[PDB]
Amino acid sequence: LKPNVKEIPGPKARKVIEEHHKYMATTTNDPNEYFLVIERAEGVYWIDVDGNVLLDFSSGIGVMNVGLRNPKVIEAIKKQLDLVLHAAGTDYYNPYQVELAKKLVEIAPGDIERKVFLSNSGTEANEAALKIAKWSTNRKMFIAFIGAFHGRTHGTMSLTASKPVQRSRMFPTMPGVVHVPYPNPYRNPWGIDGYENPDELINRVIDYIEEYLFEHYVPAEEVAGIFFEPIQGEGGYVVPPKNFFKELKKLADKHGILLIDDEVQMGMGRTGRMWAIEHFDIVPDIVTVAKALGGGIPIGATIFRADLDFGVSGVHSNTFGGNTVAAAAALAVIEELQNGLIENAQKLEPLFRERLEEMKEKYEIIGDVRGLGLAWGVEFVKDRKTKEYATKERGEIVVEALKRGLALLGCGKSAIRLIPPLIISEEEAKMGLDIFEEAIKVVSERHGYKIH
Amino acid sequence: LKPNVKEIPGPKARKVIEEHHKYMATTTNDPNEYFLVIERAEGVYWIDVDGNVLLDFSSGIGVMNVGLRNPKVIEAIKKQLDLVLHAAGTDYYNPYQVELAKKLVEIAPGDIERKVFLSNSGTEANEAALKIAKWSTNRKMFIAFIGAFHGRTHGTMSLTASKPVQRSRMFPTMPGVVHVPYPNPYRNPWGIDGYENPDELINRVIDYIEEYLFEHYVPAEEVAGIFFEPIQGEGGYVVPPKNFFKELKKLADKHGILLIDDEVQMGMGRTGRMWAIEHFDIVPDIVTVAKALGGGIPIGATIFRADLDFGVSGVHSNTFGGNTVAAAAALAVIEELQNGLIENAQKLEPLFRERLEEMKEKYEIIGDVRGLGLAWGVEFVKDRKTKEYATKERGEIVVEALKRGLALLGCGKSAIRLIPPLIISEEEAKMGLDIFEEAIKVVSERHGYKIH
Amino acid sequence: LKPNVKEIPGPKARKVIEEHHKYMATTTNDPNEYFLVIERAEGVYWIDVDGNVLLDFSSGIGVMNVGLRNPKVIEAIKKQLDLVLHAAGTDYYNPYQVELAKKLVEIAPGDIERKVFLSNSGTEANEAALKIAKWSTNRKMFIAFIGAFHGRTHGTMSLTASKPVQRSRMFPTMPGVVHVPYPNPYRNPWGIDGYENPDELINRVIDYIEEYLFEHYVPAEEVAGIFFEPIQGEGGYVVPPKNFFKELKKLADKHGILLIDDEVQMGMGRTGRMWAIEHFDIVPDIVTVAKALGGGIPIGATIFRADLDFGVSGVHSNTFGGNTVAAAAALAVIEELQNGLIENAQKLEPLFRERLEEMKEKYEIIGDVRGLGLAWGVEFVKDRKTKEYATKERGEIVVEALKRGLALLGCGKSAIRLIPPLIISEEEAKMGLDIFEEAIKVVSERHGYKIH
Amino acid sequence: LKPNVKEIPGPKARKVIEEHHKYMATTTNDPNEYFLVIERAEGVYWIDVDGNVLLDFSSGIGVMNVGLRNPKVIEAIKKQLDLVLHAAGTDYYNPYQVELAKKLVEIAPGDIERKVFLSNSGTEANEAALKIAKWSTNRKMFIAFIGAFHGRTHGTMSLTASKPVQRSRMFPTMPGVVHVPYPNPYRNPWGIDGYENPDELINRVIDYIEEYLFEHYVPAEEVAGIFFEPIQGEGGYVVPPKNFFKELKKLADKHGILLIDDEVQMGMGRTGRMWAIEHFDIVPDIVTVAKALGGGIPIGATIFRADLDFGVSGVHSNTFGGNTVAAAAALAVIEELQNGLIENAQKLEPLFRERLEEMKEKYEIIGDVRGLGLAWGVEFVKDRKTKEYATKERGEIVVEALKRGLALLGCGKSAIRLIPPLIISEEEAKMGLDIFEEAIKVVSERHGYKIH
């Protein structure tokens, strides 16, 4: 298999797209930007319904970290299908969900005692985090960051702050969430270069919380938790300053506020550590994961300090949680991660950094490149001084990449994420970065952007 | 396989219960009443880790309608694993999710224009229903029923009204839900026998909404939707009067309010119709489904009147929704239902009615029996005039059933649900009803309850 | 002065109504039913701008309990104007507000430790009650009664449940209020005659809270307070069963819930006791008062169990609270009440009961009469079996009373309140009851209602 | 009369303070900082219960703009007491409330058609503004500013953002308020000198709303209104840049958002214009006033664009609104304001500016002086570079002033407000500024602050 695209979308793809629009809700599908109609997957390739072959740099939005169709994950699922599928893990018991809980407790950040709540999704894992934090603290308010994405349910919509259309006509959602700026080193209310001056940006965000919220309208003692992504995903793959979370933990500990680390997109080895927060040297009270954990089977998990447990039965539960097929898949994923795929993320990190910095020196349309392991963001701007979003150009680059056999996703208002499966070879990665660069070159030339 | 239980919980069972308590969150697991530790499943039998064989009357909380390990569902899953598992359903397209959407549109109650939103669970499907209703009506309030169960997320916790421990320290959840009594023919605020006098009970519930809420404190024009279960599940397998939903639809239509039918537990053929609402002769605006739809794989669906669609992209979505493994499982489940299992539930209905009415005549501890198809509730009371809940005895009946090779689940404060897989044979059904009867007889003898 | 009305509204009255519509907000003013345009007041008489003289049975919505222009109140005001008007009650100190606080502590129902918070209105006094209850219990939910009226601010609009137009487009107000039926002996969801069967109605209301709310969706331990009117005012002058509050206090005490008695309309001697709650033999934790307390000057008070006090400075306050003019007026009002006016309301009670029961025997249009002291409600129905509201006829009776020199106010959907100043003589009371009776007779004749 | 203080608090004052603490709620009284116990008032002097005579620079928190005991206001009240006090302005009509509404409409900012809602307080006037804005726009969200004070009721507590103790244990209040930084030229998150660089500060605040709220988590189309003080009162007498409100109005008009101008503290001539907003050249949709309007009698008013009126009766009302005694007082206040007191504010403005800038040059403890007309703020800091709040020193200066016969109030964390009655003479004003300067000198010398 190699990148190989003729007409896209081809005739079979256009039929599926039309039927999708007829039968399915209007969501985030884009027939104009994301006309990829997947029939099968093999290693790091999609094969579309018209037989187009595309190298994958999206991992299906950071889910297929272990490969699009990993054989160790498939064999574990098949073995589990021969035994049992659903055992009602929240009314009855089974050993499968317990084996996964023990492993998640073992791989959690830091050396503190943990327990686990299993669910079906990242939004469920984050709703469970809200409940655990309210029950255990008996406090009801939360702080979250502008640009954050935590899910689309009534509790998590209040945490989420990436695009206002996510909230359209939904007010009221769960009351009690206040938002402050993320320490985004490229874009922040202070105009601070957070790469050159990380401490000044860290200090402005901490001071915003302490001086602007705590000293005026948010009683610090009534805040149950601070929700954060360790790198903002949907908000643009924004990597905050290395010392930010240590300072945030000082502020949280002073007031008895929990730290809730959303790893739904950046966990399961994406950043060359099991948990992205491992790069920032703090131990969060709660960690949420989903997506990649199940290697293609829906699963969520909420990993928490053991003393935060619900003190009485019946406060929280679900039906499908501890699904035995998801559990089997997840144990296989974690084994693949610990035995080679995380090391692969570490090995390819310098290739991404080197190639994306080379691209930033050459192509004026690139405002910023940022990343860790195999999580990279490239943000496009109309002018490097104004940092005006190049939204149209960003969309055109995604389309020019797809026409050349590379599947990319947008993030934020004018960025692209590069998140190839962790099984990707050095050669496959170079092939993708080459296609990406050709897409940037074409859209630059079209619009008269400087090429140096 | 036949029912065959020695020591339960056995040594291997005791060790998994101990480990589950150590690593997992406190949810609804009961070491004293639900010590069933499942290792595998065959036909309608659970095989525990100690080799105990139990006839299943639980369907794993109404998920395993097509059987505990259905070969056609498993074949569809293994075939889909050879193609692709996750294809980012909401960013990219795939024909598997569209084929499920087309089938769900077709099988929806009534014959009106429908679209479908796919998710990962019942609570997600109900959260999607709230969002669709708010967006489409531009109204924010909802009416739900006392005794309701709709899920445990911030939106659905406001709808749910079954046990207050479900809400412990969770306030505030989503604002704008008002609750009114369900037309529970055995227990209601008017003391109406709603079996003998269904119309009186219907009129009291409708009059409570119209006179008590609309004429005083709930502006009818600001209500987006009335959420209901066509039979209350977690609240006790409570079957409302046949004409109730026709009267509720007349009220809703007068004020432009949506009817939202939660079929998460009672749908997918459980009542001898594809949808339980079919017994009530109305066409709901929104239908929510999960559990049995995925035949053991996590899936949810929200089927809605097509003109309610979200006008704009990005108001709702998810990562896992449209999961191709869950879509293949669901198409296989629906084919199994339509090719004999729904007819089997209709055929077995009169056996359940006859045997449970015989048990009510004989065992004074039985206050009420009720059901449709293969959904039955038996409620236990200390006295038939006071209807004081026999909660202790209810748990003992479940325990004795287990000791005799029958897996049962409690519902409400003192009821048991009988929900065997729809593939159960007449002989397997008679065997489980005989075991149920022995468990009632044993606990009646033990406590001095009359046996007539 | 005697009742003496020619053309009403006269020319000067019509011009003020026109100007009011031009410059003022649309509130509850009625040009067709309440065309009384007051220029001055003397004793128990209103003198309109056209020189029409009307006997007052309105007390200006229960504010003018001590008379429309009480000389002792006016002398206290003029004396205070020679000293100081406003002294910033909550930043600086002044002896006038403290002397009122000491008197309110003394006259509070029962003999427990009390403190007082002073404000400017009923709605402010009830908002203060919510804050005191939330702070002191650290609980956030409240129970209120259908038909309640507690004010029109964001906190009190959640408590109020009288007319839905009070809440039109206001959602969301303060979250956490749940409503249950009032023990209205004439109209309740059980169809109980609560005059003949008070205990049955009490038990249905208590059982609705305990079984329907506490056992299903309202955690009893999270409820700060139950708000009630001892007689519902705006909701129809509805007098509950004598033993109701004793039963409500037993329920509240079992769960550590505060009882909050709203005396804004029924206090300051209106029922022939200083507080209406005195007829029910309980001691509320919080009592709210306004209206008659200031004898025509804006004032509110929240009298509370002293250990509920705010622990820290700055949780609540206001600018105008403790206003020295309002404090002088209030001390004068209380002295007038204690020196004969409360005794006068007790003396006139049997005259009102006798004459209204005679009117009920004679005029079929009267569905119900009810009252205590000088607080009476008369509810008009189209038919005594259906109890359909006679809303049109109710308004016509008010209009005909006005044409004959009696000022009346509607309450609820089809009732009239009789609330004459407490200084009214037996002869003035007989005169107003005779006019009321003629207005009922005229509107009965006009519409063909039976007269027995 | 002249400043004349012996012992303060003296023996009569200490008795009142002790009784206040025994009988009254814990609010914002300070026996340590504000031991002023007022017995009477004469011109611009308080006379305390021990006969101490103090020049007033507090106007009783900006209420006594027309003098502590104005004879024209007292004569109008007395004349009204001879006619009627309360006429139930929201059920019946009277000419007195209508005369005040017409005048308020005439003196409103700009030349647009207005209507008026009368209430009893500033918090009531602002709750009415919330209701008018929700009803008329059918939108439910609001923006307010950090440092803002709009009142302590459930709706206005959500708008208020000055001290967190104001909200302690009150969550949830009315949902839907988001807060952004005020363009405070001395203290802001950007470190901008808003005196030297006003446009840069204006632009940061506008960009915070547009880029940080509108482009991320607040749908601009769902915002009913932006609440602002034209000068923040309780937050420190912060005067924003002259062009800020013009830019805010551009943003509001683009999105159909109302501008709500809270003049409760800065209106009724305080700033040398009837309305403080008149200095900033915009016409707000709604203006709220209270305090000073009634010259010592409780009153509130909400003045709004006439097309925002409630389209149906019964949405909003009160009992005491249109109180005839308050209305008489208010017309007298406005006549005094238009015929000499506003001109006096204009005449004394340069004296305050000159004396306070002289004090800032001499006393290093002064960080900032700011003001308009007879509204002045002086902020004290421990160091002019850190701007660390000198809270203790600020309290000591208030006490040293009181000991020398000047009544001052604190504002913000370390500021003092100078708000003498608008009748103050040039000589009286110089006497006050001299005492203030002596208090600053004493506290400077005590703590070793530089005197230049």
JSON list of C-alpha atoms in Angstrom, two decimals, chain B residues 199-329:
[
{"chain": "B", "resi": 199, "resn": "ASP", "atom": "CA", "xyz": [-59.45, 6.70, 32.72]},
{"chain": "B", "resi": 200, "resn": "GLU", "atom": "CA", "xyz": [-59.70, 8.23, 36.22]},
{"chain": "B", "resi": 201, "resn": "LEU", "atom": "CA", "xyz": [-55.87, 7.90, 36.67]},
{"chain": "B", "resi": 202, "resn": "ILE", "atom": "CA", "xyz": [-55.11, 9.27, 33.15]},
{"chain": "B", "resi": 203, "resn": "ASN", "atom": "CA", "xyz": [-57.38, 12.31, 33.83]},
{"chain": "B", "resi": 204, "resn": "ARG", "atom": "CA", "xyz": [-55.72, 13.03, 37.24]},
{"chain": "B", "resi": 205, "resn": "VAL", "atom": "CA", "xyz": [-52.19, 13.03, 35.63]},
{"chain": "B", "resi": 206, "resn": "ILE", "atom": "CA", "xyz": [-53.30, 15.20, 32.65]},
{"chain": "B", "resi": 207, "resn": "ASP", "atom": "CA", "xyz": [-55.20, 17.55, 35.02]},
{"chain": "B", "resi": 208, "resn": "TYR", "atom": "CA", "xyz": [-52.07, 17.80, 37.28]},
{"chain": "B", "resi": 209, "resn": "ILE", "atom": "CA", "xyz": [-50.05, 19.07, 34.27]},
{"chain": "B", "resi": 210, "resn": "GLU", "atom": "CA", "xyz": [-52.80, 21.32, 32.86]},
{"chain": "B", "resi": 211, "resn": "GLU", "atom": "CA", "xyz": [-54.29, 22.80, 36.08]},
{"chain": "B", "resi": 212, "resn": "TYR", "atom": "CA", "xyz": [-51.42, 22.43, 38.64]},
{"chain": "B", "resi": 213, "resn": "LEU", "atom": "CA", "xyz": [-48.41, 23.29, 36.36]},
{"chain": "B", "resi": 214, "resn": "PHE", "atom": "CA", "xyz": [-49.66, 25.22, 33.27]},
{"chain": "B", "resi": 215, "resn": "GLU", "atom": "CA", "xyz": [-52.22, 27.39, 35.15]},
{"chain": "B", "resi": 216, "resn": "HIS", "atom": "CA", "xyz": [-49.78, 28.32, 37.95]},
{"chain": "B", "resi": 217, "resn": "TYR", "atom": "CA", "xyz": [-45.98, 28.21, 37.43]},
{"chain": "B", "resi": 218, "resn": "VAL", "atom": "CA", "xyz": [-44.95, 26.46, 34.18]},
{"chain": "B", "resi": 219, "resn": "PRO", "atom": "CA", "xyz": [-45.63, 28.48, 31.00]},
{"chain": "B", "resi": 220, "resn": "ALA", "atom": "CA", "xyz": [-46.86, 25.78, 28.56]},
{"chain": "B", "resi": 221, "resn": "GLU", "atom": "CA", "xyz": [-45.31, 27.71, 25.59]},
{"chain": "B", "resi": 222, "resn": "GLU", "atom": "CA", "xyz": [-41.78, 27.48, 27.21]},
{"chain": "B", "resi": 223, "resn": "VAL", "atom": "CA", "xyz": [-41.83, 23.62, 27.45]},
{"chain": "B", "resi": 224, "resn": "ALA", "atom": "CA", "xyz": [-39.69, 21.99, 24.72]},
{"chain": "B", "resi": 225, "resn": "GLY", "atom": "CA", "xyz": [-40.61, 18.36, 25.48]},
{"chain": "B", "resi": 226, "resn": "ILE", "atom": "CA", "xyz": [-42.28, 15.77, 27.74]},
{"chain": "B", "resi": 227, "resn": "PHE", "atom": "CA", "xyz": [-39.87, 12.85, 28.39]},
{"chain": "B", "resi": 228, "resn": "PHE", "atom": "CA", "xyz": [-41.40, 9.46, 29.23]},
{"chain": "B", "resi": 229, "resn": "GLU", "atom": "CA", "xyz": [-40.71, 5.75, 29.39]},
{"chain": "B", "resi": 230, "resn": "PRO", "atom": "CA", "xyz": [-43.61, 3.79, 27.87]},
{"chain": "B", "resi": 231, "resn": "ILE", "atom": "CA", "xyz": [-43.10, 1.38, 30.82]},
{"chain": "B", "resi": 232, "resn": "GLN", "atom": "CA", "xyz": [-40.94, 2.66, 33.69]},
{"chain": "B", "resi": 233, "resn": "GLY", "atom": "CA", "xyz": [-37.97, 0.38, 33.96]},
{"chain": "B", "resi": 234, "resn": "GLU", "atom": "CA", "xyz": [-35.65, 1.14, 36.87]},
{"chain": "B", "resi": 235, "resn": "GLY", "atom": "CA", "xyz": [-38.70, 2.63, 38.66]},
{"chain": "B", "resi": 236, "resn": "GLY", "atom": "CA", "xyz": [-40.38, -0.88, 38.87]},
{"chain": "B", "resi": 237, "resn": "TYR", "atom": "CA", "xyz": [-41.52, -2.19, 35.38]},
{"chain": "B", "resi": 238, "resn": "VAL", "atom": "CA", "xyz": [-44.61, 0.04, 35.74]},
{"chain": "B", "resi": 239, "resn": "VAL", "atom": "CA", "xyz": [-47.11, -0.28, 32.83]},
{"chain": "B", "resi": 240, "resn": "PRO", "atom": "CA", "xyz": [-49.32, 2.82, 32.43]},
{"chain": "B", "resi": 241, "resn": "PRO", "atom": "CA", "xyz": [-52.94, 2.78, 31.19]},
{"chain": "B", "resi": 242, "resn": "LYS", "atom": "CA", "xyz": [-53.37, 1.87, 27.51]},
{"chain": "B", "resi": 243, "resn": "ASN", "atom": "CA", "xyz": [-54.90, 5.28, 26.60]},
{"chain": "B", "resi": 244, "resn": "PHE", "atom": "CA", "xyz": [-52.45, 7.47, 28.64]},
{"chain": "B", "resi": 245, "resn": "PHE", "atom": "CA", "xyz": [-50.10, 8.53, 25.76]},
{"chain": "B", "resi": 246, "resn": "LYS", "atom": "CA", "xyz": [-53.02, 9.40, 23.47]},
{"chain": "B", "resi": 247, "resn": "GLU", "atom": "CA", "xyz": [-54.23, 11.86, 26.18]},
{"chain": "B", "resi": 248, "resn": "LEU", "atom": "CA", "xyz": [-50.64, 13.15, 26.81]},
{"chain": "B", "resi": 249, "resn": "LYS", "atom": "CA", "xyz": [-50.24, 13.71, 22.99]},
{"chain": "B", "resi": 250, "resn": "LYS", "atom": "CA", "xyz": [-53.51, 15.74, 22.89]},
{"chain": "B", "resi": 251, "resn": "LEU", "atom": "CA", "xyz": [-52.15, 17.98, 25.72]},
{"chain": "B", "resi": 252, "resn": "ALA", "atom": "CA", "xyz": [-48.66, 18.32, 24.12]},
{"chain": "B", "resi": 253, "resn": "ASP", "atom": "CA", "xyz": [-50.09, 19.13, 20.65]},
{"chain": "B", "resi": 254, "resn": "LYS", "atom": "CA", "xyz": [-52.29, 21.95, 22.12]},
{"chain": "B", "resi": 255, "resn": "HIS", "atom": "CA", "xyz": [-49.05, 23.76, 23.28]},
{"chain": "B", "resi": 256, "resn": "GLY", "atom": "CA", "xyz": [-46.50, 22.73, 20.55]},
{"chain": "B", "resi": 257, "resn": "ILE", "atom": "CA", "xyz": [-44.61, 20.46, 23.03]},
{"chain": "B", "resi": 258, "resn": "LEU", "atom": "CA", "xyz": [-42.55, 17.49, 21.72]},
{"chain": "B", "resi": 259, "resn": "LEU", "atom": "CA", "xyz": [-43.14, 13.93, 22.95]},
{"chain": "B", "resi": 260, "resn": "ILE", "atom": "CA", "xyz": [-39.85, 12.18, 23.70]},
{"chain": "B", "resi": 261, "resn": "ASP", "atom": "CA", "xyz": [-40.18, 8.36, 24.08]},
{"chain": "B", "resi": 262, "resn": "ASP", "atom": "CA", "xyz": [-37.26, 6.75, 25.96]},
{"chain": "B", "resi": 263, "resn": "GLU", "atom": "CA", "xyz": [-37.11, 3.13, 24.58]},
{"chain": "B", "resi": 264, "resn": "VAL", "atom": "CA", "xyz": [-33.62, 2.51, 25.97]},
{"chain": "B", "resi": 265, "resn": "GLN", "atom": "CA", "xyz": [-34.96, -0.39, 28.11]},
{"chain": "B", "resi": 266, "resn": "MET", "atom": "CA", "xyz": [-38.38, -1.25, 26.58]},
{"chain": "B", "resi": 267, "resn": "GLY", "atom": "CA", "xyz": [-37.51, -1.10, 22.85]},
{"chain": "B", "resi": 268, "resn": "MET", "atom": "CA", "xyz": [-35.83, -3.57, 20.40]},
{"chain": "B", "resi": 269, "resn": "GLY", "atom": "CA", "xyz": [-38.74, -6.07, 20.67]},
{"chain": "B", "resi": 270, "resn": "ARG", "atom": "CA", "xyz": [-38.77, -6.46, 24.52]},
{"chain": "B", "resi": 271, "resn": "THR", "atom": "CA", "xyz": [-42.64, -5.99, 24.75]},
{"chain": "B", "resi": 272, "resn": "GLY", "atom": "CA", "xyz": [-43.52, -8.10, 21.68]},
{"chain": "B", "resi": 273, "resn": "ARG", "atom": "CA", "xyz": [-43.45, -4.99, 19.43]},
{"chain": "B", "resi": 274, "resn": "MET", "atom": "CA", "xyz": [-40.33, -3.32, 18.01]},
{"chain": "B", "resi": 275, "resn": "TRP", "atom": "CA", "xyz": [-41.14, -0.31, 20.24]},
{"chain": "B", "resi": 276, "resn": "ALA", "atom": "CA", "xyz": [-43.12, -0.41, 23.52]},
{"chain": "B", "resi": 277, "resn": "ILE", "atom": "CA", "xyz": [-44.88, 2.85, 22.50]},
{"chain": "B", "resi": 278, "resn": "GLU", "atom": "CA", "xyz": [-46.57, 0.73, 19.74]},
{"chain": "B", "resi": 279, "resn": "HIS", "atom": "CA", "xyz": [-48.94, -0.75, 22.44]},
{"chain": "B", "resi": 280, "resn": "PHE", "atom": "CA", "xyz": [-50.10, 2.88, 23.17]},
{"chain": "B", "resi": 281, "resn": "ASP", "atom": "CA", "xyz": [-50.93, 3.93, 19.53]},
{"chain": "B", "resi": 282, "resn": "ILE", "atom": "CA", "xyz": [-48.94, 7.23, 19.36]},
{"chain": "B", "resi": 283, "resn": "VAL", "atom": "CA", "xyz": [-46.05, 8.38, 17.19]},
{"chain": "B", "resi": 284, "resn": "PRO", "atom": "CA", "xyz": [-43.44, 10.14, 19.35]},
{"chain": "B", "resi": 285, "resn": "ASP", "atom": "CA", "xyz": [-41.45, 13.14, 17.94]},
{"chain": "B", "resi": 286, "resn": "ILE", "atom": "CA", "xyz": [-38.18, 11.71, 19.35]},
{"chain": "B", "resi": 287, "resn": "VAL", "atom": "CA", "xyz": [-37.33, 8.09, 20.23]},
{"chain": "B", "resi": 288, "resn": "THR", "atom": "CA", "xyz": [-34.16, 7.22, 22.20]},
{"chain": "B", "resi": 289, "resn": "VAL", "atom": "CA", "xyz": [-32.63, 3.70, 22.02]},
{"chain": "B", "resi": 290, "resn": "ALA", "atom": "CA", "xyz": [-29.48, 1.94, 23.33]},
{"chain": "B", "resi": 291, "resn": "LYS", "atom": "CA", "xyz": [-28.70, -1.30, 25.19]},
{"chain": "B", "resi": 292, "resn": "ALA", "atom": "CA", "xyz": [-30.27, -4.07, 23.13]},
{"chain": "B", "resi": 293, "resn": "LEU", "atom": "CA", "xyz": [-29.67, -2.15, 19.85]},
{"chain": "B", "resi": 294, "resn": "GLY", "atom": "CA", "xyz": [-25.91, -3.05, 19.94]},
{"chain": "B", "resi": 295, "resn": "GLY", "atom": "CA", "xyz": [-26.47, -6.74, 20.96]},
{"chain": "B", "resi": 296, "resn": "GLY", "atom": "CA", "xyz": [-23.68, -6.36, 23.59]},
{"chain": "B", "resi": 297, "resn": "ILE", "atom": "CA", "xyz": [-21.66, -3.55, 21.83]},
{"chain": "B", "resi": 298, "resn": "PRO", "atom": "CA", "xyz": [-22.08, 0.06, 23.18]},
{"chain": "B", "resi": 299, "resn": "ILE", "atom": "CA", "xyz": [-24.39, 2.14, 20.91]},
{"chain": "B", "resi": 300, "resn": "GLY", "atom": "CA", "xyz": [-27.13, 4.78, 21.27]},
{"chain": "B", "resi": 301, "resn": "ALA", "atom": "CA", "xyz": [-29.54, 6.30, 18.77]},
{"chain": "B", "resi": 302, "resn": "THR", "atom": "CA", "xyz": [-31.85, 9.29, 18.81]},
{"chain": "B", "resi": 303, "resn": "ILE", "atom": "CA", "xyz": [-34.50, 8.97, 16.08]},
{"chain": "B", "resi": 304, "resn": "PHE", "atom": "CA", "xyz": [-36.33, 12.21, 15.45]},
{"chain": "B", "resi": 305, "resn": "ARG", "atom": "CA", "xyz": [-38.95, 13.98, 13.35]},
{"chain": "B", "resi": 306, "resn": "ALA", "atom": "CA", "xyz": [-36.75, 15.14, 10.47]},
{"chain": "B", "resi": 307, "resn": "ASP", "atom": "CA", "xyz": [-37.66, 18.89, 10.54]},
{"chain": "B", "resi": 308, "resn": "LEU", "atom": "CA", "xyz": [-36.24, 19.09, 14.09]},
{"chain": "B", "resi": 309, "resn": "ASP", "atom": "CA", "xyz": [-32.69, 18.63, 12.62]},
{"chain": "B", "resi": 310, "resn": "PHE", "atom": "CA", "xyz": [-29.90, 21.06, 13.89]},
{"chain": "B", "resi": 311, "resn": "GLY", "atom": "CA", "xyz": [-29.87, 23.95, 11.29]},
{"chain": "B", "resi": 312, "resn": "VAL", "atom": "CA", "xyz": [-26.04, 24.43, 11.50]},
{"chain": "B", "resi": 313, "resn": "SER", "atom": "CA", "xyz": [-22.94, 22.09, 11.83]},
{"chain": "B", "resi": 314, "resn": "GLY", "atom": "CA", "xyz": [-21.15, 21.71, 15.21]},
{"chain": "B", "resi": 315, "resn": "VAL", "atom": "CA", "xyz": [-24.16, 22.07, 17.67]},
{"chain": "B", "resi": 316, "resn": "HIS", "atom": "CA", "xyz": [-23.80, 18.34, 18.54]},
{"chain": "B", "resi": 317, "resn": "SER", "atom": "CA", "xyz": [-21.47, 15.43, 17.60]},
{"chain": "B", "resi": 318, "resn": "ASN", "atom": "CA", "xyz": [-19.13, 12.88, 19.33]},
{"chain": "B", "resi": 319, "resn": "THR", "atom": "CA", "xyz": [-15.99, 10.76, 18.42]},
{"chain": "B", "resi": 320, "resn": "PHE", "atom": "CA", "xyz": [-17.35, 7.14, 18.73]},
{"chain": "B", "resi": 321, "resn": "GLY", "atom": "CA", "xyz": [-20.96, 7.68, 17.37]},
{"chain": "B", "resi": 322, "resn": "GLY", "atom": "CA", "xyz": [-21.42, 5.67, 14.10]},
{"chain": "B", "resi": 323, "resn": "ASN", "atom": "CA", "xyz": [-18.73, 3.15, 15.36]},
{"chain": "B", "resi": 324, "resn": "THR", "atom": "CA", "xyz": [-18.63, 0.56, 12.51]},
{"chain": "B", "resi": 325, "resn": "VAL", "atom": "CA", "xyz": [-18.38, -2.48, 14.88]},
{"chain": "B", "resi": 326, "resn": "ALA", "atom": "CA", "xyz": [-21.52, -1.24, 16.78]},
{"chain": "B", "resi": 327, "resn": "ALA", "atom": "CA", "xyz": [-23.30, -0.48, 13.41]},
{"chain": "B", "resi": 328, "resn": "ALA", "atom": "CA", "xyz": [-22.65, -4.08, 12.10]},
{"chain": "B", "resi": 329, "resn": "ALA", "atom": "CA", "xyz": [-23.86, -5.57, 15.47]}
]
